[PDB]
Amino acid sequence: NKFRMSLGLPVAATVNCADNTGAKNLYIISVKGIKGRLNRLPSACVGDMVMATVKKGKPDLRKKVMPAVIVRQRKPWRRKDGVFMYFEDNAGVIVNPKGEMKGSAITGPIGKECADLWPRIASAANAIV
Amino acid sequence: LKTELCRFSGQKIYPGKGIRFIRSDSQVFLFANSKCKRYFHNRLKPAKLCWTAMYRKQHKK
Amino acid sequence: SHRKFEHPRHGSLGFLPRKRCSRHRGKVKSFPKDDQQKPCHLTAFLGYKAGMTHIVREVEKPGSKLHKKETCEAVTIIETPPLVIVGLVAYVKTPRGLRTLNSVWAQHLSEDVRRRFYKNWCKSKKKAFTKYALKYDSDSGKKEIQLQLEKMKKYATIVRVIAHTQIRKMKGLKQKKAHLMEIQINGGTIADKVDYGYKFFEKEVPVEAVFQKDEMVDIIGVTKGKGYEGVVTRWGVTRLPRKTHRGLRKVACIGAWHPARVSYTVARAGQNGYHHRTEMNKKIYKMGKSGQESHEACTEFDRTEKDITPMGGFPHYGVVKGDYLMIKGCCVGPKKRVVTLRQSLLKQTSRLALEEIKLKFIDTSSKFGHGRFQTTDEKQKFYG
RNA sequence: UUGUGGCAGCCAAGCGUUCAUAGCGACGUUGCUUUUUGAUCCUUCGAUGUCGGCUCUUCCUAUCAUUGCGAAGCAGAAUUCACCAAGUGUUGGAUUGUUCACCCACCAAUAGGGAACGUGAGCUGGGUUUAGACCGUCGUGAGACAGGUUAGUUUUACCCUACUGAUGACAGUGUCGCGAUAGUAAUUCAACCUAGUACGAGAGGAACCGUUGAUUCACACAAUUGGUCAUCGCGCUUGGUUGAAAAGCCAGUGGCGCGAAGCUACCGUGUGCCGGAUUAUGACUGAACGCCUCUAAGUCAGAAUCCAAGCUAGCAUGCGACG
RNA sequence: GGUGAACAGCCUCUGGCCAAUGGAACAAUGUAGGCAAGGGAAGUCGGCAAAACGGAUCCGUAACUUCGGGAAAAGGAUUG
Numbered sequence: 013n014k015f016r017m018s019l020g021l022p023v024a025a026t027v028n029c030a031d032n033t034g035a036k037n038l039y040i041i042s043v044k045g046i047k048g049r050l051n052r053l054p055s056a057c058v059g060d061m062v063m064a065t066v067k068k069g070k071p072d073l074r075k076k077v078m079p080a081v082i083v084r085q086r087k088p089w090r091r092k093d094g095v096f097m098y099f100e101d102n103a104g105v106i107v108n109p110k111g112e113m114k115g116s117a118i119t120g121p122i123g124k125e126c127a128d129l130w131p132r133i134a135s136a137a138n139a140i141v
Numbered sequence: 142l143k144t145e146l147c148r149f150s151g152q153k154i155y156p157g158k159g160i161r162f163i164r165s166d167s168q169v170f171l172f173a174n175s176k177c178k179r180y181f182h183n184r185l186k187p188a189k190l191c192w193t194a195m196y197r198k199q200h201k202k
Numbered sequence: 203s204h205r206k207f208e209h210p211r212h213g214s215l216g217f218l219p220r221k222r223c224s225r226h227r228g229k230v231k232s233f234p235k236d237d238q239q240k241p242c243h244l245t246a247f248l249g250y251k252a253g254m255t256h257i258v259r260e261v262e263k264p265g266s267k268l269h270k271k272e273t274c275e276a277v278t279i280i281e282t283p284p285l286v287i288v289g290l291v292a293y294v295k296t297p298r299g300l301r302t303l304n305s306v307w308a309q310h311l312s313e314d315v316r317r318r319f320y321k322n323w324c325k326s327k328k329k330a331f332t333k334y335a336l337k338y339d340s341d342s343g344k345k346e347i348q349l350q351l352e353k354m355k356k357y358a359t360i361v362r363v364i365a366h367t368q369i370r371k372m373k374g375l376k377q378k379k380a381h382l383m384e385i386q387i388n389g390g391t392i393a394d395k396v397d398y399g400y401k402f403f404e405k406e407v408p409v410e411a412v413f414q415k416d417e418m419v420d421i422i423g424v425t426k427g428k429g430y431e432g433v434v435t436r437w438g439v440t441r442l443p444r445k446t447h448r449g450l451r452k453v454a455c456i457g458a459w460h461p462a463r464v465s466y467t468v469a470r471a472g473q474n475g476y477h478h479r480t481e482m483n484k485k486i487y488k489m490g491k492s493g494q495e496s497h498e499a500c501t502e503f504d505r506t507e508k509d510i511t512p513m514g515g516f517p518h519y520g521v522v523k524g525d526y527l528m529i530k531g532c533c534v535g536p537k538k539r540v541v542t543l544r545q546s547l548l549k550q551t552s553r554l555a556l557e558e559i560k561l562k563f564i565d566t567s568s569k570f571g572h573g574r575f576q577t578t579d580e581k582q583k584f585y586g
Numbered sequence: 587u588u589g590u591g592g593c594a595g596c597c598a599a600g601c602g603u604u605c606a607u608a609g610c611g612a613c614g615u616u617g618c619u620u621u622u623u624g625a626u627c628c629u630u631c632g633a634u635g636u637c638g639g640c641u642c643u644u645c646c647u648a649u650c651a652u653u654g655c656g657a658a659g660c661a662g663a664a665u666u667c668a669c670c671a672a673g674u675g676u677u678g679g680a681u682u683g684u685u686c687a688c689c690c691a692c693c694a695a696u697a698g699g700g701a702a703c704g705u706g707a708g709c710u711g712g713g714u715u716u717a718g719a720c721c722g723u724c725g726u727g728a729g730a731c732a733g734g735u736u737a738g739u740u741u742u743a744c745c746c747u748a749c750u751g752a753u754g755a756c757a758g759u760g761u762c763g764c765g766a767u768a769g770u771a772a773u774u775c776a777a778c779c780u781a782g783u784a785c786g787a788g789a790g791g792a793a794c795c796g797u798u799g800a801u802u803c804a805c806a807c808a809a810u811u812g813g814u815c816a817u818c819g820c821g822c823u824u825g826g827u828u829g830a831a832a833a834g835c836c837a838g839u840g841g842c843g844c845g846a847a848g849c850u851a852c853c854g855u856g857u858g859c860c861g862g863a864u865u866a867u868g869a870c871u872g873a874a875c876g877c878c879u880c881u882a883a884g885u886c887a888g889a890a891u892c893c894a895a896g897c898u899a900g901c902a903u904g905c906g907a908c909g
Numbered sequence: 910g911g912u913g914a915a916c917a918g919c920c921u922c923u924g925g926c927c928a929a930u931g932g933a934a935c936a937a938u939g940u941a942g943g944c945a946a947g948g949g950a951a952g953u954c955g956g957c958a959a960a961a962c963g964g965a966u967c968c969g970u971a972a973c974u975u976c977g978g979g980a981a982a983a984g985g986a987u988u989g
């Protein structure tokens with residue numbers, strides 16, 4: 013499926029919510045697909061569907077866990093090309109548990125490895141890079 | 142081969158090296174090494190560092 | 203009193219004891235199994251870890267994301283001059299194991315392989331094998347030698363050749379005395395093996411006679427030395443909290459009350475590195491054979507006429523002039539270290555073993571600092 | 587010792603829509619365990635440092651997942667019962683000092699346990715357990731509380747052994763070897779195809795082979811990325827100072843920017859292993875027993891199991907060849 | 910003496926000293942000092958320890974109030 017990229021977003025991370033959903037802010041509480049190991053904080057990367065809660069935003073989205081997808085990461089990571097490509101800020105989008113895009117559009121550039129794994133986030137994306 | 146130009150020092154990066162920073166305005170900036178990345182992040186202007194190709198082409202050296 | 207929260211062991215017990223290797227040269231503790239149906243060939247060879255670079259290639263891997271896509275991979279260059287055959291050793295099976303039946307040595311030995319037999323070559327009178335190489339200028343001597351070779355053909359089951367490196371044709375190594383080992387012959391009958399070795403005394407064996415491109419090898423050697431070193435670094439145990447009296451970086455409990463002993467499997471502080479390790483299944487990307495178009499670091503796409511050595515030579519190793527290999531991934535030991543290249547023991551049948559490797563670009567920018575040009579010639583044209 | 591705590595058998599009234607035994611099994615009844623609690627008071631009161639957590643190691647099975655199986659009121663999917671099975675794994679967090687508890691989430695799974703209720707010259711000192719102090723109930727009072735709260739010193743290893751590594755004598759000296767024995771390491775999951783196929787009224791809905799990755803772990807290594815700077819490498823710069831410029835120097839590394847070399851990171855990269863015997867189980871031939879029958883004699887297929895192979899050590903005061 | 914609000918710290922002049930047993934090496938664990946990518950208390954009984962803020966000028970300054978304060982609130986800008 014996807015390749016292994018540097019895990020930059022541990023639990024308790026606070027990321028921008030890069031869509032027109034109303035939430036200004038997500039708060040990572042766990043990452044899907046991680047099998048744990050003593051004392052290691054689960055970490056999230058681009059394309060990692062996570063569980064996030066909104067700490068600053070629309071009151072109709074706050075105080076409930078919800079699947080998100082990380083689309084921008086500030087931790088440099090090693091593309092297979094050799095380049096260490098990264099973004100300016102950590103940012104994610106709210107998705108339904110199957111991965112359908114909850115919102116309508118995505119503000120800011122979006123990662124290619126996230127797009128090629130999530131078709132609908134890829135569709136709502138505006139500038140893949 | 143397909144080289145590419147750094148957008149701070151203007152020097153050709155060869156395949157297998159380079160750091161590309163994706164600024165929030167969706168532009169792609171390819172730095173050749175750490176030194177360009179840091180001079181860029183520190184808010185310095187490439188056209189005023191005496192070693193940069195932008196400086197050299199601006200003063201015709 | 204059970205462990206509240208399980209977690210897998212730190213470090214592996216399959217590598218104890220971890221101490222100084224009592225051998226600088228990586229010993230082949232197992233040779234490829236003999237196959238008398240195949241044509242006769244060697245099974246091991248000696249190189250020297252020159253340095254690392256990286257490459258970029260076009261992957262052909264149906265079903266991968268990287269298919270039809272270029273990828274960047276770290277490679278290691280192993281400068282690997284042809285060995286010299288200076289002996290032929292026979293082994294016979296006994297209920298104890300294998301015996302060195304008897305050994306035969308070539309008439310001449312180089313001024314440096316005869317250094318391997320001394321610890322103070324200078325103050326010596328340099329007489330190693332002097333009275334043996336007189337077994338060749340006499341009729342009785344040649345009679346005895348051919349008697350020994352017939353003994354070897356008729357009795358031996360495992361035949362090995364003595365071969366040494368030409369440690370002098372690499373000036374970058376500040377060393378004059380050669381590395382000598384036994385490379386086991388495989389294939390053919392015993393008579394074919396012994397005839398192959400004897401005929402091939404005193405003559406140089408190229409690395410291609412041993413290996414082929416795309417072939418999987420196993421690199422053996424002694425890791426870098428890191429010295430007497432604490433437990434957190436040796437074994438990987440987690441550190442204790444910041445506020446601990448008498449030090450943080452250690453193991454808190456070194457065993458339960460009973461047994462009333464320190465178990466051998468508790469992490470302790472001691473030698474790290476300079477261990478013996480075999481690291482298997484390293485792929486061969488390119489053979490550089492000195493003297494023709496395949497030597498240089500020019501691929502079929504890139505044509506900047508440059509040699510494999512980077513700008514300013516390989517760090518701590520110098521410039522590669524002799525033949526060499528290029529293996530994917532890292533290599534045991536520091537630069538300048540002797541390594542033993544051994545054919546695989548497994549049967550390479552997976553896709554990852556069978557890909558043909560076709561490069562696109564061999565990075566040459568100096569590995570000393572942030573190299574920015576591929577050739578000193580291009581740097582000179584860029585500066586003027 | 588085992589009342590008590592936990593566990594597991596026997597019979598079979600019934601439940602299980604019909605049906606005792608798929609799955610339970612009441613009235614009864616037989617046992618096992620030493621993590622609970624009780625009983626005792628045998629060692630210890632010229633002191634065995636007392637709860638918990640962190641760390642780290644090892645072992646047990648009364649098996650939660652993981653491999654292989656048998657049974658079903660097993661159509662598929664899922665789930666339940668049991669068998670050979672302890673190799674491997676069993677997580678991040680809210681609140682509490684808490685073990686325990688109970689939620690959020692991941693997970694293939696969030697099983698239970700022992701090791702002087704493992705582990706204080708290993709930590710911590712939150713609780714408890716001195717002296718200060720406050721409240722409440724009690725006492726006439728000093729004071730008490732298996733009531734609540736706050737503050738309250740955590741000493742020593744250099745000995746022996748154990749363990750980790752380091753030399754080293756013993757047939758002169760040196761190269762190459764042999765390999766007794768000991769350690770051992772790999773684990774699991776995901777996606778595509780198979781396939782919306784088998785199965786199924788429909789609803790739903792597998793898997794084998796094949797391909798590509800990943801998780802935990804291990805061993806290396808440093809081309810790139812990152813990290814580190816007292817290269818006091820270059821530059822800049824504050825305060826003082828050598829009359830000034832230049833050059834410097836002091837402020838224990840003056841400070842800042844970049845910073846090679848080395849070291850290093852799942853924060854970077856690579857690699858991680860082939861045969862034989864078998865357990866459960868299902869079978870072959872085949873009697874006892876004119877039939878049947880996997881067992882009785884003989885055979886077979888068979889697993890994260892076993893032993894090898896492979897990897898490490900090899901002062902085994904072991905051995906071989908040659909100089 | 911200089912900087913500086915300053916008997917702060919930092920540096921120098923008069924005066925006084927180099928007295929704390931020295932040589933080699935730069936291993937683990939320490940004592941003291943630092944720096945760290947992404948995250949930012951998830952660690953832990955507990956933000957313990959460290960980092961961060963810090964001078965000055967200009968603006969602005971909430972609840973509450975015993976009307977005295979809070980107040981250097983908070984929040985901004987500038988500095989060679």
Ligand SMILES: [Mg+2]
Nearest residue numbers: 050051052207
């Ligand atoms: Mg923990």
Ligand SMILES: [Mg+2]
Nearest residue numbers: 174175176812
């Ligand atoms: Mg760097």
Ligand SMILES: [Mg+2]
Nearest residue numbers: 203204205206
């Ligand atoms: Mg415990």
Ligand SMILES: [Mg+2]
Nearest residue numbers: 204205206208
């Ligand atoms: Mg457990």
Ligand SMILES: [Mg+2]
Nearest residue numbers: 435436437438
């Ligand atoms: Mg490591």
Ligand SMILES: [Mg+2]
Nearest residue numbers: 445446447448
């Ligand atoms: Mg303390």
Ligand SMILES: [Mg+2]
Nearest residue numbers: 568569570571
């Ligand atoms: Mg380098």
Ligand SMILES: [Mg+2]
Nearest residue numbers: 588590591619
């Ligand atoms: Mg009992």
Ligand SMILES: [Mg+2]
Nearest residue numbers: 588589590591
């Ligand atoms: Mg009972």
Ligand SMILES: [Mg+2]
Nearest residue numbers: 627628629630
């Ligand atoms: Mg008594």
Ligand SMILES: [Mg+2]
Nearest residue numbers: 630631633634
């Ligand atoms: Mg007592």
Ligand SMILES: [Mg+2]
Nearest residue numbers: 630632633634
């Ligand atoms: Mg006593």
Ligand SMILES: [Mg+2]
Nearest residue numbers: 459634635707
């Ligand atoms: Mg004691």
Ligand SMILES: [Mg+2]
Nearest residue numbers: 633634635707
């Ligand atoms: Mg005592």
Ligand SMILES: [Mg+2]
Nearest residue numbers: 647648649671
């Ligand atoms: Mg059992």
Ligand SMILES: [Mg+2]
Nearest residue numbers: 705706707708
């Ligand atoms: Mg103790």
